Amino acid sequence: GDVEKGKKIFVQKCAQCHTVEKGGKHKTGPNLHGLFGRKTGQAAGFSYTDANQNKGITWGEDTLMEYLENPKKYIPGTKMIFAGIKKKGERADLIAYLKKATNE
Ligand code: HEC
């Protein structure tokens, strides 16, 4: 994936609901710092659905690749109202961006 392309995707498709930085605010969706290795539904201070709390997976490259294609298919009942990113390359770029931005 291409980090710079992924940054642009994040701004267009994600940033209205999510921050990535350490100490960034929860918004409509949870702050995503530490995403890689985070268990579903475990960010303190965010009110998740039971569906997101109970999915029982660890976020990382492949679980994110699947989720982001079609969130509701991966986590039925999620309150993340986002249809998905259909192009594999776009998902890969976004994930590469997230891997950097959620760790910095
Ligand atoms: C607002 C309209 C959203 C947009 C646009 C995106 N996300 Fe989101 N996300 C949102 C909510 C309300 C939640 C919680 C859902 C629930 O059912 O409780 C989420 C959740 C995620 C998660 C899971 C995080 C966890 O701690 O388990 C991830 C990884 C995530 N969102 C990522 C993400 C990305 C990368 C987006 C752009 C493609 C994106 N979301 C858009 C709300 C909104």
Numbering used by the authors: 1 to 104
What did the study's authors say about this model?
Our data show that Cytc is acetylated on lysine 53 in both androgen hormone-resistant and -sensitive human prostate cancer xenografts. As the cost to grow enough xenografts to obtain preparative amounts of Cytc for functional studies is prohibitive, we replaced the lysine residue with glutamine, which mimics acetylated lysine. This mutation (K53Q) converts the positive charge of the lysine side chain to a neutral charge, similar to the effect of lysine acetylation seen with the acetylated protein in vivo. Only the K53Q acetylmimetic mutant crystallized and gave a high-resolution structure at 1.31 Å in space group P21212 with two independent monomers in the asymmetric unit. The electron density for Q53 in molecule B is better defined because its side chain is immobilized by a hydrogen bond to the carbonyl oxygen of Y40. The side chain of Q53 in molecule A interacts only with a water molecule within 3.5 Å. Of the new mutants studied here only the K53Q Cytc mutant crystallized and gave a high-resolution structure at 1.31 Å that showed good omit map density for Q53 and confirmed that the mutation caused no major structural disturbance or unfolding at its location, although there is a moderate distortion at R38-Q42 due to crystal packing. Interestingly, molecular dynamics simulations revealed that K53Q has increased flexibility at the T28 epitope, a loop previously shown to be an important regulatory domain. We propose that the increased mobility of this loop may explain the increased ROS scavenging activities of acetylmimetic Cytc due to a more flexible and thus open structure, allowing easier access of superoxide and H2O2 to the heme group. The experimental results showed that acetylmimetic K53Q and K53I Cytc resulted in a lower oxygen consumption rate compared to WT and K53R Cytc. Interestingly, acetylmimetic K53Q and nonpolar K53I resulted in significantly 80% and 87% reduced caspase-3 activity, compared to the WT.
Cytochrome c (Cytc) is a globular 104 amino acid heme protein that orchestrates cellular life and death decisions. It functions as an electron carrier in the electron transport chain (ETC) and as a trigger of apoptosis when released from the mitochondria. Cytc transfers single electrons from complex III (bc1 complex) to complex IV (cytochrome c oxidase, COX) where oxygen is reduced to water in the ETC. Cytc also acts as a signaling molecule for apoptosis upon release from the mitochondria, by interacting with apoptosis protease activating factor-1 (Apaf-1) and forming an active apoptosome, which initiates caspase-9 activity and the downstream caspase cascade.
